[model samples]
Target: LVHGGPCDKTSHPYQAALYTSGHLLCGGVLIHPLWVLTAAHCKKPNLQVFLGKHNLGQQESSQEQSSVVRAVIHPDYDAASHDQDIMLLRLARPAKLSELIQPLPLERDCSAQTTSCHILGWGKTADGDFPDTIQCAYIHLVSREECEHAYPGQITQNMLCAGDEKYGKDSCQGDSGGPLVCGDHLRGLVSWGNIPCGSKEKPGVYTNVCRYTNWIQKTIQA
Candidate 1:
């Protein structure tokens, strides 16, 4: 979210905000009317999901708020290593899908080549700005080799690394679990990054959503 351009809710209908008692905690995306996908690390108590939100400072009429009935974390999710860091939360009620509130298509295949992509989230901090509207930016995929070098022994098949150090754009604090849209499909989700995000040699790490599609389907159906 740091250094990315500001965007509106209409641009990303599936974009969701995770909150705890009215305080923004992380980002998430709707995959089914009642299911949301996010980083497993974000499973917090009293979590609520809000859709069709534009300006966090205002009461948008389009907002549909729902409480989480249950949070299904990956069975192999590692708190120590951060592997399998993904989760699915079932809403207490459907989000009431609308023109400005819909689920995004998931990328179930990761073998396909996807390059150009966009990311959206509600954060305006490069350790500075805080705001209402969300931030959006263009980013591209990085090879596993290159990303592995960036965070040696940390990047894995279950994860995706995007953004260019030269571009100086990245998802940082308050943007965790945000969507990384590639060719109209939900490809990745903001997971981890450096302290001073968005700079040389500091691309963001994301959960490779495609790698977890099977888990998502099974978790939702069950």
Candidate 2:
């Protein structure tokens, strides 16, 4: 639904949902007991994070909902162009880590042109149609050069691109801030892409997590 098909209900324990004014705004990844990794552009007033969530509408007792006490956008983030679109959300209370709620590992560098990645979210399956349960899709990394050529001058060094070579497989409008996983590491954060859902040669772009490992670690520690 998100792009290709539905994921195993409990496959991604680090997945989180961000809501504002009781509406789902974006997806996120729980990086630590008290920190979540998301996109800076998703910032909004009265933000709350939902952890261990599969269905958005039906509240499960296993789900942990927490108010966002603090949100820190990267110092160099440029809202106008979505450059350096990564942000960290500090939870009011630490999340209880369990089989269904856990944090993902961060890496300084992850393969981009070689490894396959997967993205998950409860975003729209199509125009004006959102999914109640989380949906996911597998994506192949598009090289920096290939992406630059595909998007022209829009692709920046802080971003990485990935999607299927064929159409009908990509991150859509409501999928921002979702985690892009490759193997056991969190490599990117879903940021942006071409409109109208998936389009040929228009891959979804993500905020390269490996590019900001030091910043993430320092911010969490601070």
The Cα local distance difference test for each model comes to: 0.85, 0.85
What tens-digit string does per-residue lDDT give for candidate 2 at 119-191?
8888888645988878988878877898888778888889988888765588876689998898878989988
RMSD of 1: 1.3
Candidate 1, poorest ten consecutive residues by summed lDDT: 122-131
Q: What is candidate 2's CA lDDT for residue 65?
A: 87
CA RMSD of each candidate after superposition:
1.3, 1.5
Where does model 2 exceed 4 Å of error? Answer: 110-113
lDDT for 136 (candidate 2): 80
